[PDB]
């Protein structure tokens, strides 16, 4: 799967105004609250690390063992393509959703070990067949815990603006072109309040 995207940063002081602008020009938003745990094979190559995502927006913070009562999406994110400066970014992204018992332990059995984990807090909008997410990456107050509070990595942490769309087949030239065209439309639509550009991933 191919992910075409644009990235931008929104200072904490402008958050309110940018969100209202996004609500005035786009469809949405829907809240985003995800728990991510990353596993690496047991120069390191992170594009081969397993990135597990659980939607904690649908959990009881009181649930002592939420990780076993959840569905995890498993991702493999490659490095974005180079020489695409001044153009939208592109990177390979593969996904598979897995359940049954404790996925965490299953991936360790496959030969992987825990690397790091974090929480994503934000809003998600939609327009021109693309998704625009504005979020902050947080740190659990206790490893593998969904019980607040969650701490920012820095007190003057900006919000990240990530605009993207997915194309199933990289070979489909028409689909790829329609996606870049859609990103371009969203870019100018948000250019009045946020600079979006290709950033390496």
């Amino acid at each position: 799967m191919q992910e075409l995207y644009l990235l931008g940063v929104v200072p904490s002081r402008r958050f309110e105004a940018v969100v209202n602008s996004l609500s005035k020009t786009l469809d949405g938003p829907k809240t985003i609250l995800e728990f991510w745990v990353v596993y690496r094979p047991k120069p390191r190559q992170p594009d081969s690390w397993l990135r597990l995502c659980s939607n904690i927006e649908s959990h009881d913070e009181t649930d002592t063992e939420w990780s076993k009562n959840t569905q995890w999406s498993m991702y493999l994110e490659g490095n974005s393509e180079p020489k695409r400066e001044d153009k939208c970014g592109i990177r390979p992204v593969n996904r598979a959703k897995l359940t049954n018992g404790s996925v965490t332990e299953f991936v360790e059995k496959m030969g992987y070990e825990f690397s790091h984990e974090y929480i994503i807090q934000g809003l998600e909008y939609f327009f021109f067949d693309t998704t625009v997410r504005i979020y902050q990456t947080l740190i659990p107050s206790q490893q593998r815990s969904i019980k607040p509070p969650f701490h920012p990595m820095n007190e003057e942490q900006p919000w990240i603006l990530h605009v993207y769309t997915h194309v199933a087949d990289a070979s489909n030239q028409v689909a790829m072109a329609k996606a870049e065209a859609n990103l371009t439309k969203v870019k100018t639509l948000l250019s009045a309040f946020c600079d979006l550009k290709n950033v390496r991933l």
């Binding site: 990235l7 990353v38 992170p46 974090y118 990456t137 942490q157 900006p158 990240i160 950033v199």
Partner: peptide, 23 residues
């Protein structure tokens, strides 16, 4: 500076590397 934060935050999510700026 917010652009430096972006780079460090993106790096952390990607490789778990925590820059000094991200305490």
């Amino acid at each position: 500076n917010a652009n430096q934060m972006l780079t460090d935050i993106l790096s952390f999510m990607k490789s778990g590397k925590r820059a000094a700026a991200l305490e």
